[PDB]
Symmetry: C2
Subunit: 175 residues, 2 copies
């Protein structure tokens, strides 16, 4: 277990940038992506016994403005946030939760069971919210999380994902 | 009468809405484009006899995502290989002549069982259509595989993409 976790109920943008550098959880813990792969600006809630299965609830936010890098290239003439990046935000939060519980290793998304898109994030939106309900959390020799997730734009559910799966790996030589 | 392969220049023209008709769905441009070439397109080809696309992405250590995902541990985001598969499903719908704005509508089971590191050489995408539906919404359903240097590393079942006359 990684005893160096700065374990709090919420995290700021500075915390998320520190995580990208490996500083928030310390040397052993999984970093978030940095730069243009970081898909949120804050984590508003982390509740270890919360959510649908009483195994974890995580809520995070991404602030929207028209200049975010992905709007200009996806697509020319038709800006819209890539659904794959909202899905990645949820994978990143699953791995972050495993690190928050003291899990050590590199994060690797393992997949998802089903994703349904029913709406979109346009450049005139204001806020994307990610809500993660953890269903299975293994914190042993194997470190893995299984969760369901939703993406909201300005309070409206637009993506659902069931069976998001992420593991932490001291070594990725099996990949 | 349709071409069966497309070059990087063609894919960049697609991003500008300039490969097919003005109404055809553009590929992503810039950093969101996840392919260098389409090597094969077969109408009613592939594993279900309903359509096939094969495409490639050349790997080098300077691809933008390596530097930020993750610091100290460069690896291609699985989500971007998944997006390439959605991109190719929508591209096939436009290749058939479908018009509209492309939107991923969902996917069934996705498995990431291997990884793309900066020392890899080539990623291959293989898309096997199961259904093409030409209605007010044009929809494509397909299974997909991603390979790195000959090894299957990602799979996706029931990729679904729509072409919308208007947006959802």
């Amino acid at each position: 277990s990684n005893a160096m976790v700065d374990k709090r109920e919420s995290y700021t943008k500075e915390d998320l940038e520190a995580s990208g550098r490996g500083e928030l959880f310390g040397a052993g813990g999984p970093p978030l992506p940095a730069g243009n792969m970081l898909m949120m600006d804050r984590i508003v809630k982390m509740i270890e016994d919360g959510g649908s299965h009483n195994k974890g609830y995580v809520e995070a936010e991404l602030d929207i403005n028209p200049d975010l890098w992905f709007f200009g290239c996806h697509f020319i003439g038709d800006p819209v946030m890539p659904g794959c990046l909202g899905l990645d935000a949820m994978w990143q939060l699953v791995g972050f939760y495993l690190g928050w519980l003291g899990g050590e290793g590199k994060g690797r998304a393992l997949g998802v069971g089903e994703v349904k898109f029913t709406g979109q994030v346009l450049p005139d939106a204001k806020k994307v919210t990610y809500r993660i309900n953890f269903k299975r959390v293994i914190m042993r020799k194997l470190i893995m999380g299984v969760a369901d997730g939703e993406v909201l734009v300005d309070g409206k559910v637009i993506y659902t994902a069931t069976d998001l799966k992420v593991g932490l790996f001291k070594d990725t030589n099996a990949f």
